[PDB]
Design a protein around this ligand. Structure first.
Ligand SMILES: N[C@@H]1[C@@H](O)[C@H](O)[C@@H](CO)O[C@@H]1O
Length: 321
């Protein structure tokens, strides 16, 4: 064994989070690290306390996905000062250095979602008009902040589309259900609802159903690729799911961990991570790998490369030498 790695996961409340524990644990194990997971259960002060605890344990590395991206900056600094490598998973922290960061191309995921919304709202006469209800996730999470930026950039170019945006605080599907019910009663002309993770869409479907809607009446889209999302595609409720590449983000951390722990430089460039072109840059917050997401529709929903089909790579993750 090469040592222990602590993963500070923000919650265990959807398939991405629990999937990330499983993938990081398995992949790191393939490259000779034992992973231990601590769950913040959506409490910032818990995760901050967990950081102190783990710093005291002096592990080979810490993997953090911050509950709140502004709140954790001091903890990151403390860990690194104690000589412990810190890796950011999924939730990008740009305001202080980390030793590695592994994220989806989130602005690009918002762009893809934007392109599909536009396509979905384009009318017979070539114009783009309608009303979109957008349901971001928690404001403390750069994943949704950056998807929102990309999405809005696309949609704003077509001012005949009105957009209503209401975040689901703490990523709660229950909030999303309330939002969809209240907003649809006030705006019967909502044509499309874009939610930033598929577990939110599950609540949206129930809210639509309770208002008498059937699959396809209101177009629906979400943006993380979770299994419940792909199942809503198959059932006709969801028009599009723009996945983030969970397995690849996890695999990349395992692939580069020897370099992180060895304090060896991580060279900028294009890498293959589980078949995806993954881009490493040197940023002010340290080495960063950005891995692309993809749009999933009924036409390609069964592609085993998409993590919501729960067919992880068969072959050995290997350390980057
Ligand atoms: N990128 C992840 C999503 O996949 C996930 O749904 C939320 C909530 O767990 O956290 C992060 O934002």
């Amino acid at each position: 064994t090469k040592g222990m790695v602590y993963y500070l996961v923000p919650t265990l409340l959807d398939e991405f989070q629990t999937g990330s524990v499983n993938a990081l644990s398995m992949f790191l194990g393939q490259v000779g690290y034992e992973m231990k997971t601590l769950n913040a259960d959506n409490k910032t002060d818990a995760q901050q306390s967990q950081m102190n605890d783990v710093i005291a344990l002096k592990p080979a590395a810490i993997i953090l996905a911050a509950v709140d991206f502004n709140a954790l900056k001091p903890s990151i600094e403390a860990a690194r000062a104690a000589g412990i490598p810190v890796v950011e998973f999924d939730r990008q922290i740009t305001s202080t250095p980390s030793d590695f960061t592994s994220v989806a191309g989130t602005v690009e995921i918002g762009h893809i979602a934007g392109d599909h919304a536009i396509s979905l709202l384009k009318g017979k006469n070539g114009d783009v008009k309608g009303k979109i209800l957008q349901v971001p996730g928690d404001p403390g999470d750069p994943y949704t902040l950056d998807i929102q930026k990309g999405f809005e950039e696309k949609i704003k170019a077509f001012p005949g589309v009105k957009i209503i945006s209401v975040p689901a605080v703490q990523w709660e599907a229950s909030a999303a259900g309330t939002i969809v019910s209240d907003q649809m009663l006030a705006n019967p002309d909502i044509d499309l609802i874009f939610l930033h993770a598929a577990h939110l869409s599950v609540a949206a479907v129930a809210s639509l159903e309770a208002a008498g809607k059937k699959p396809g009446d209101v177009m629906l889209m979400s943006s993380n690729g979770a299994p419940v999302g792909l199942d809503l595609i198959r059932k006709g409720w969801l028009n599009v799911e723009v996945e983030q590449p969970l397995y690849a983000q996890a695999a990349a951390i395992a692939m580069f961990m020897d370099k992180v722990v060895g304090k060896k430089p991580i060279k900028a460039g294009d890498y293959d991570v589980l078949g995806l072109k993954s881009v490493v840059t040197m940023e002010t917050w340290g080495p960063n790998i950005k891995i692309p997401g993809s749009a999933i529709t009924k036409e390609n929903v069964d592609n085993p490369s998409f993590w919501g089909n729960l067919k992880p790579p068969t072959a050995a993750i290997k350390s980057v030498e």
